[PDB]
C-alpha cells in the first residue's frame, strides 16, 4: 500500500523541477481516493474514478508539484497557459486522476515563499511530460546577451510568492497527478 508517501509528503517539489515516483509490484487499495472527499478538484479523466478496486494496474506514476491557485485548471488535457505550456504539459491521451487541494498552512510565508519557481520564458513550447531544468539566460532581444542579465536579458525562472494573506487565486495548491495506463 504505497499511496502514503506521495500525498502526504512533506515538501512537494517546484513546478519546473516536478517530482515523480513509480508505483509497481503491489496492488493498490484506492480508498484514500473518492472516499475521504478531502480533495477539491478531482477531475479523473479516462477511467471513471469509483471502479478502481476491481481493476489492477502495473507501473503507474505519481508525479506531483505545487502551483498557484488560479492555475490549477491548467493541469488538464490541451489547456494553454503559463504553466501548462512552459512547465508541465499534459498530453491529449491522458488517463488518470488530477487531484488537487488547498494547502495554505504548509506552503506559504509571511513575505513571499520564493522557493517555488516557474519558467516564465522559453524558446518554444513543451512536449508532453518534457521537463526543463536548465537556467540559461533568455536574451529576449536580438542582441546576444551572454549571461549579463540586463536589458532584454531576463533570468527565465521567475519566482512565485505565496503569502498567507492573499485571495483565492494566489495560493499554493499541491497538485498530484495520478497517471494510470494499461499494462
Amino acid at each position, epitope marked *: 500500500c504505497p499511496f502514503g508517501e506521495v500525498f502526504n509528503a512533506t515538501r512537494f517539489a517546484s513546478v519546473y523541477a516536478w517530482n515523480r515516483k513509480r508505483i509497481s509490484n503491489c496492488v493498490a487499495d484506492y480508498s484514500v481516493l473518492y472516499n475521504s472527499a478531502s480533495f477539491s*478538484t478531482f477531475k479523473c479523466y479516462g477511467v471513471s474514478p469509483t471502479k478502481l478496486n476491481d481493476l489492477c494496474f502495473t507501473n503507474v506514476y505519481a508525479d506531483s508539484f505545487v502551483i498557484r491557485g488560479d492555475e*490549477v485548471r491548467q493541469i488538464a488535457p490541451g489547456q494553454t497557459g503559463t504553466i501548462a505550456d512552459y512547465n508541465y504539459k499534459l498530453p491529449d491521451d491522458f488517463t488518470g486522476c488530477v487531484i488537487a487541494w*488547498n494547502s495554505n498552512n504548509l506552503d506559504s510565508k509571511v513575505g513571499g515563499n520564493y522557493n517555488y519557481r516557474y519558467r516564465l520564458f522559453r524558446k518554444s513550447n513543451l512536449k508532453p511530460f518534457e521537463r526543463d531544468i536548465s537556467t540559461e539566460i533568455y536574451q529576449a532581444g536580438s542582441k546576444p546577451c551572454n549571461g549579463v542579465k540586463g536589458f532584454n536579458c531576463y533570468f527565465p525562472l521567475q519566482s512565485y510568492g505565496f503569502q498567507p494573506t492573499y485571495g483565492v487565486g494566489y495560493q499554493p495548491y499541491r497538485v498530484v497527478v495520478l497517471s494510470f495506463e494499461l499494462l
Partner: antibody, heavy 119, light 113 residues
Framework: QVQLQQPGAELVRPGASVKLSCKASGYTFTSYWMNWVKQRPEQGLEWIGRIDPYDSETHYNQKFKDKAILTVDKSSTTAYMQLSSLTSEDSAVYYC????????????WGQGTTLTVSQ | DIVMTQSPSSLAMSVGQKVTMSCKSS????????????LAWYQQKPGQSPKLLVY???TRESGVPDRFIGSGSGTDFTLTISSVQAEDLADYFC?????????FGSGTKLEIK
C-alpha cells in the same frame, strides 16, 4: 466587473418543461465551474448540480435526478438548465452561481429567476 | 448527506451591539491534510441576490466590510458581526463546503429593533 445576467420570470403549465438560462460576462468563460441553487420559501436553499465549461462533467444531487438536466454552451458564453415535468412544488427561485476551480464556495451570483406553476 | 441546523432562527437586535448566530452539522468538517476547516456564510437582502460574506472558517472576503468575523472549527460555528448597522437587513445562510451534496442550512432573519 463579474456579471451574471438572468431572465426576469417564467410562467409554465403543470406538465411541461422549461429552459432556464443565465449569461456569464466579465471573465473568461472556460475556467470556473457553474452551480445552480434552488430557493423555495420556508425550506431554505438546496444544491442542484454543476457543470464544467471546458469538459462537461456534470454531477447532480440525489433528490434531483431525472428532473433537472444541466447543459453548458461555450458559444455566446451562456449557461443553461433544463427542468422537466414540473409539479406543484416548483414555484421557487433558481439562481446561477460560479466557482469551482479551487473551492466550492460561491462568490458571484445571479439576481434570481421566479418560477410559477398554475393555470 | 449532512443536515445543517441553525439554533437562532430569527434575530432582533438594536443598532450598535454584538450579534452572534450559529450553524451546526453532523460530520467534523475539517479534512486531515491541511487542517483548515470548511464552511461558508451568505447574505441575501430581500429582493436582491445573495452575496458571499465569509469563506472557509474565519476569512472575510475582499469587498465585504470588516465587521463580519467568522469562527468555528469542526461541527459548531458562529458568525459574528461586531457592530450591527442599518444595512444589515437580510438573512444569513450557513453552507456546507466539505463534501457532496452541498446541503445549505436554514435562514436567520435579522430585523433591527
Amino acid at each position: 466587473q463579474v456579471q451574471l445576467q438572468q431572465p426576469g420570470a417564467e410562467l409554465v403549465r403543470p406538465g411541461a418543461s422549461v429552459k432556464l438560462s443565465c449569461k456569464a460576462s466579465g471573465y473568461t468563460f472556460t475556467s470556473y465551474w457553474m452551480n445552480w441553487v434552488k430557493q423555495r420559501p420556508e425550506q431554505g436553499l438546496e444544491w442542484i448540480g454543476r457543470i464544467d465549461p471546458y469538459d462537461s462533467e456534470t454531477h447532480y444531487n440525489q433528490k434531483f435526478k431525472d428532473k433537472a438536466i444541466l447543459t453548458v454552451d461555450k458559444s455566446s458564453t451562456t449557461a443553461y438548465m433544463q427542468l422537466s415535468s414540473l409539479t406543484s412544488e416548483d414555484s421557487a427561485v433558481y439562481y446561477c452561481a460560479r466557482w469551482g476551480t479551487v473551492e466550492w464556495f460561491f462568490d458571484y451570483w445571479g439576481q434570481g429567476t421566479t418560477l410559477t406553476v398554475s393555470q | 448527506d449532512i443536515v445543517m441546523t441553525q439554533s437562532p432562527s430569527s434575530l432582533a437586535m438594536s443598532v450598535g451591539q454584538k450579534v452572534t448566530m450559529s450553524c451546526k452539522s453532523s460530520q467534523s468538517l475539517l479534512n486531515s491534510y491541511n487542517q483548515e476547516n470548511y464552511l461558508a456564510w451568505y447574505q441575501q437582502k430581500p429582493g436582491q441576490s445573495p452575496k458571499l460574506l465569509v469563506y472557509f472558517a474565519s476569512t472575510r472576503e475582499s469587498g465585504v466590510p470588516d465587521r463580519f468575523i467568522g469562527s468555528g472549527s469542526g461541527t459548531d460555528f458562529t458568525l459574528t458581526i461586531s457592530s450591527v448597522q442599518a444595512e444589515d437587513l437580510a438573512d444569513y445562510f450557513c453552507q456546507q463546503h466539505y463534501s457532496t451534496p452541498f446541503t445549505f442550512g436554514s435562514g436567520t432573519k435579522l430585523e433591527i429593533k
